[PDB]
Ligand binder design. Structure first.
Ligand SMILES: [Mn+2]
Ligand SMILES: [Mn+2]
Length: 429
């Protein structure tokens, strides 16, 4: 059990008092990812209810350049700064420039102290042994502050961040605590359901652009429409009922045998976007596109911001199916590999995993960047991609971490030799 929360609650009561007693400008810096926008929304709602006007800025990276610019505004009547999914790692520069500052972070800390001089407070649950890799997100840290004011309804946005940062399989620690609070206070219903019911669009559209999972023989409106018609589902239906689910699963198992991946615990939230999965996806797509303020408007439930969000999400999903259909996969005994576009190799690699591991790579300058990916059924059968990718050391290179995700870097001239060798090291099956 978590007496770690009692230790958390000491810092939250202080953050509350620091906000309640601050009568000047308040300045909120947050990130463009789902965890950042969610954090933005929770913070926005918390501060409006506490009668604080504030200026919200969304930032890609919190670099030295950006701290300096933020700092040039700290001479002119110094605002309280609230850093969201960031600040713990750049704290030395924040202390230097003498910001009146609150850091709400879950990235690994540089200073394992909550109270850093008068007028800096860092809430980073690593300091209490939580783990921002698996048990808490920024949305969640921001929610832990919101609770001190009695704003349990902001838990809905906390859950969006949990899904954003991929900390919902499995749901551990504080994240588990937050979801249970949201359920206790009636702001989320959790129910097992087929993945296609997340999108509240026509089922054939839900199936065609779905990448969780990506079933390639169904990845176009035509094929998905044919497939649904041939087994008696109204393809323009927006929710599959229990009878439809059976007909769908019964038939799809021939094209996609791992039925269990089509069934998901759905978070149904008290938010105009009724599905936390859908909201997470929407927020990520407006963030990818630099529509940060629209992002904040989706969190605040603006009808037009949501219409924009829906349009951008479905554009994003079409482009992603187009990029997947264009990958030239190459078989190699134990492994598929592909050459791909800078920034895309990892996300593509994880979507293309069925039976065997998948290594994507980009050739930039003198160097080849690999991203190797697998699944739980692959680690259970003996797979660790960390040891596989480490074989880069044999080619003058370096090789990455984790049993499913891992990367590597090798000279462009040694690609075919490296992949050959990573393939052999998957004798561990
Ligand atoms: Mn994050
Ligand atoms: Mn982030």
């Amino acid at each position: 059990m978590m007496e770690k929360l009692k230790e958390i609650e000491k810092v939250t009561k202080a953050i509350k008092e620091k906000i309640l007693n601050h009568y000047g400008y308040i300045r909120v810096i947050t990130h463009h990812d789902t965890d950042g926008l969610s954090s933005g929304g929770i913070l926005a709602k918390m501060l409006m209810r506490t009668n604080k006007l504030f200026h919200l800025t969304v930032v890609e990276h919190l670099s030295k350049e950006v701290i300096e610019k933020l700092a040039k505004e700290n001479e002119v009547n110094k605002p309280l700064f609230i850093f969201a999914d960031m600040g713990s790692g750049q704290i030395e520069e924040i202390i230097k420039h003498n910001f009146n500052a609150i850091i709400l972070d879950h990235h690994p800390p540089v200073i394992k102290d909550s109270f850093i001089n008068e007028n800096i407070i860092q809430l980073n649950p690593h300091i209490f042994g939580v783990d921002g890799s698996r048990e808490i997100t920024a949305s969640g840290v921001c929610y832990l502050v919101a609770r001190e004011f009695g704003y349990y309804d902001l838990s809905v946005l906390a859950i969006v961040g949990i899904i954003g940062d991929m900390q919902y399989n499995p749901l551990l620690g504080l994240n588990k605590f937050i979801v249970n609070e949201a359920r206790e206070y009636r702001y989320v219903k959790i129910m097992n359901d087929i993945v296609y019911n997340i999108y509240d669009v026509e089922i054939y559209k839900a199936i065609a652009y779905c990448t969780k999972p990506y079933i390639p023989d169904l990845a176009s409106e035509g094929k998905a429409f044919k497939f649904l018609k041939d087994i008696g589902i109204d393809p323009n239906k927006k929710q599959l009922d229990d009878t439809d689910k059976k007909k769908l699963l019964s038939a799809i198992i021939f094209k996609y045998p791992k039925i269990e991946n089509l069934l998901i615990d759905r978070y149904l939230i008290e938010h105009k976007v009724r599905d936390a999965f859908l909201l997470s996806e929407m927020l990520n797509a407006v963030g990818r596109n630099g529509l940060f303020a629209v992002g904040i408007g989706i969190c605040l439930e603006d009808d037009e911001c949501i219409k924009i969000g829906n349009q951008i999400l479905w554009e994003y999903k079409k482009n992603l199916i187009n990029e997947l259909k264009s990958v030239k996969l190459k078989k190699l005994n134990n492994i598929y590999y592909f050459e791909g576009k800078k920034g895309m190799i990892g996300i593509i690699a994880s979507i293309l995993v069925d039976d065997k591991p998948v290594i994507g790579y980009h050739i930039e300058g003198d160097i080849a960047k690999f991203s190797a990916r697998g699944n739980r059924d692959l680690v259970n059968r003996g797979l660790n991609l960390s040891v596989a990718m480490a074989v880069a050391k044999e080619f003058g290179g370096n090789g990455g971490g984790h049993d499913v995700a891992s990367g590597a870097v090798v000279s462009k001239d040694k690609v075919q030799e490296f992949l050959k060798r990573v393939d052999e090291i998957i004798g561990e099956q």
